[PDB]
């Protein structure tokens, strides 16, 4: 299964994933490509920020869906 991630500067990456992949696992894949650590990563889909301990299936993320990658401005 492929999904996409809209990254920080306007670039889109492609991830090979299973419905059963955890968000943690999805973050490792993103780290593997972009070198942004998982604990910095926030992933947004259909208004939901994706939480560790859940799977893509939980979120109903299908083939060719796009996750939106954002980090944090702490204040």
């Amino acid at each position: 299964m492929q999904i996409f991630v809209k990254t920080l500067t306007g670039k889109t990456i492609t991830l090979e994933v299973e419905p059963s992949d955890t968000i943690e696992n999805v973050k490792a894949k993103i780290q593997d490509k972009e070198g942004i650590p998982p604990d910095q990563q926030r992933l947004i889909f259909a208004g939901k920020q994706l939480e560790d301990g859940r799977t893509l299936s939980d979120y109903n993320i299908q083939k060719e869906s796009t996750l939106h990658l954002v980090l944090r401005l702490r204040g």
């Binding site: 490509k33 947004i44 208004g47 944090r72 204040g75």
Partner: protein, 335 residues
């Protein structure tokens, strides 16, 4: 006048206050709270988060019935949001977009007209993809359907063309906000520049080559977003973070955005006039690790802008609302 109450800093809670004021000044959301319409939508039975919607609504009510320089204490609401989203426990500085997402999610879940969510993703290839957009939309709407959603939810169309067989695979993703990358190309970078960067053709090749299911192999493909359904409230999130593989820094790039007549027809998949006026901005000043949030908000109907900075509320002119510190932009449909 009204709704010009400040919010007490409870210990780095500016991120929370900034959002609370943007939402306080979200007309239709405010009226939902003042008119007590949430009471109908609330779920029967003993729940853990019934208190979230009631405490939020009571804050908004207090803000909008207070005298012009009263300070309201959101402490009881904070207790409720931190139960819902444990990450907001304690008194650390946080991101205001992360906050907005968790809060709207919590409020939406509690007044959702769908009380038991239905459990099939069938093939709609026989359909014009505007018809399948509609089918996808109604499938989304039978799981998520509240007054909050009425206001914030749009629909994205993602069109992915295989360059070999030419097939265009379309998916429809709902969105409660849009997170925009920032153009490097500045005279100055504009909001429109950031929206075109988000909706540009992404050429997917090499390690990014998706598999084409018609071709049964990895191919160069072109991916493009367009907006299939425009939301009543358009929340725009500026991606102010550099891409560094070692150490991320905040991009302080001035993004010029308009007060009025944000015309987004360019970005529509095949539109019917989608134009917005600005009514709130959440501002960040500092670094990715720390700083301060404020809000600039236009009083509903009134055209009058104020700077909301925790307990302090101060008139401003519209010539002062566009700044580098703009991180979230709240737009509403214009007439």
């Amino acid at each position: 006048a009204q709704g010009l109450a400040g919010l007490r800093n409870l210990g780095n809670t500016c991120f929370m206050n900034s959002i609370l004021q943007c939402l306080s000044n979200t007309r239709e959301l405010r009226d939902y709270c003042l008119q007590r319409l949430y009471m109908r939508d609330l779920h029967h039975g003993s729940n853990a988060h019934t208190a979230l919607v009631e405490e939020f609504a009571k804050l908004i009510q207090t803000i909008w019935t207070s005298s012009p320089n009263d300070v309201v204490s959101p402490s009881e609401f904070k207790t409720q949001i931190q139960r819902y989203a444990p990450r907001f426990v304690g008194y650390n500085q946080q991101d205001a977009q992360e906050f907005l997402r968790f809060l709207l999610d919590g409020l939406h879940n509690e007044v959702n007209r769908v009380t038991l969510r239905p459990k099939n993703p069938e093939n709609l290839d026989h359909l014009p993809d505007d018809e399948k957009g509609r089918q996808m939309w109604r499938k989304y709407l039978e799981r998520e359907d509240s007054r909050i959603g009425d206001l914030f939810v749009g629909q994205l169309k993602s069109s992915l063309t295989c360059t070999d067989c030419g097939y265009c695979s379309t998916v429809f993703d709902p969105f409660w906000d849009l997170s925009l990358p920032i153009a490097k190309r500045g005279p100055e970078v504009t909001l429109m520049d950031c929206m075109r960067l988000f909706t540009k053709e992404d050429v997917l090749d090499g390690d990014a080559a998706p598999t084409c299911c018609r071709c049964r192999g990895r191919k160069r493909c072109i991916k493009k977003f367009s907006i299939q359904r425009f939301p009543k409230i358009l929340v725009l999130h500026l991606k102010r973070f550099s891409e560094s593989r070692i150490r991320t820094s905040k991009l302080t790039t001035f993004v010029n955005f308009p007060l009025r007549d944000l015309d987004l027809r360019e970005f529509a998949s095949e539109n019917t006039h989608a134009v917005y006026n600005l009514y709130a901005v959440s501002n960040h000043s500092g670094t990715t690790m720390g700083g301060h949030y404020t809000a600039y908000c236009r009083s509903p109907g009134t055209g009058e802008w104020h700077t909301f900075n925790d307990s302090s509320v101060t008139p401003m002119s519209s010539s002062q609302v566009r700044t580098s510190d703009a991180y979230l932009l709240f737009y509403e449909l214009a007439s």
